[PDB]
Design a protein around this ligand. Structure first.
Ligand code: ADP
Ligand code: ADP
Lengths: 92, 153, 43, 49, 43
């Protein structure tokens, strides 16, 4: 009988360790990565999908040309200076 | 094959439930761990009582009788050492387990901190394509856009 | 009985030995600081 | 006040104790930095849209 | 038990000896740098 008790003293002990690692693999396997970069991880799967539509929308509508924005901002700068001319005009 | 975003919530739904189950059993080992811890202390005290007899075993002035008691305890003494060492290994053994759990949970929260963040961005672009795709143009000139369709009509 | 005893402990980490050690020492410094008040007010 | 006793030894443990948090502080501190401008880009979409 | 133990490890490479060595040394430099703060604030 003395032998039996020593067995039970460990019976539950192994089970906890079993569950200890069972989750451990379960956790990090599910949490394998967030920046997998291969779409295999769940996170990166979403990431690629986000960018998928990002360019999809851009194609449907061409963006401003570098000249267009360059003249646009310069036109604003000329407007800024032209308004600055109004600044000098009204102040002096 | 399901929606990658939808399964995330289900994935995290089972995520914590499995995690807690671990937390339940961890205390289980510790409880029995102390159970033997007390058990060891019980037996040595019995030897002390046997030792207490040994101390007064010579009160009669007889050394013979003390011998039997001193030989009597030794059975327990080995048992004392047998169990005393047994818990020594387990002492640091569980401690390694605790580091896992505390370390592990901290990881989970960082995940949830972004769980909703991706979803909003997902909806952010989902509409973005939906909006401008529906609003592709007003002067398409090809009748494909809804506006020009009316114009030609 | 012991099953829940540790169960509760896990749900809330107990004080660190340093925390209690500084806590009691801080009290001891408070004791001496109050003892400084003892000397300050008596003398 | 770790040296209020005049002991430099004890201060060491506390200074080593915080460092765990210090890295955690930096770890989380940077985390929100990227998100700060990240959402701002989102707002421009909505108002523009 | 050991079967999964290494299984998890493969799925995530552990710290390199240099990484931990610099990490602890960086802490030691932080310890000394904090120790520099110790001397800086105390003296
Ligand atoms: N420190 C890191 N920084 C950036 N990416 C990493 C890092 N560690 C791992 N990764 C990425 O995680 C991926 C591994 O994730 P996993 O899904 O388990 O395998 P697979 O890449 O074959 O899908 C690698 O492809 C790698 O690009
Ligand atoms: N700045 C613009 N001025 C006038 N028409 C434009 C302009 N930009 C785009 N369009 C018109 O929008 C149309 C594109 O609309 P869409 O329905 O997406 O493609 P599709 O023309 O093949 O139907 C083009 O045919 C073009 O004539």
């Amino acid at each position: 009988e003395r032998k039996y008790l020593e067995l039970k003293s460990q019976k539950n002990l192994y089970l906890a360790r079993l569950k200890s690692a069972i989750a451990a693999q379960k956790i990090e396997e599910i949490a394998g990565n967030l920046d997998n970069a291969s779409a295999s991880s769940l996170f990166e799967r979403i990431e690629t999908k986000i960018l998928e539509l990002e360019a999809e929308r851009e194609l449907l509508n061409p963006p401003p040309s570098p000249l267009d924005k360059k003249f646009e901002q310069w036109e604003e700068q000329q407007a800024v200076e032209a308004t600055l001319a109004a600044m000098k005009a009204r102040r002096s | 094959q399901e929606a990658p975003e939808d399964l995330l919530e289900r994935l995290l739904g089972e995520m914590e439930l499995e995690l807690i189950e671990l937390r339940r059993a961890l205390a289980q080992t510790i409880a029995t761990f102390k159970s033997t811890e007390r058990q060891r202390d019980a037996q040595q005290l019995i030897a002390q009582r046997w030792y207490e007899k040994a101390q007064a075993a010579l009160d009669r002035g007889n050394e013979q009788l003390a011998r039997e008691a001193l030989g009597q305890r030794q059975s327990y003494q080995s048992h004392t050492e047998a169990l005393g060492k047994s818990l020594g290994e387990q002492r640091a053994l569980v401690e390694q387990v605790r580091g896992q759990l505390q370390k592990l949970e901290r990881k989970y929260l960082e995940l949830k901190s972004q769980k909703n963040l991706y979803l909003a961005r997902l909806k952010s672009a989902i509409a973005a394509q939906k909006i401008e795709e529906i609003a592709g143009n007003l002067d398409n000139a090809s009748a494909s856009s809804l506006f020009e369709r009316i114009e030609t009509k």
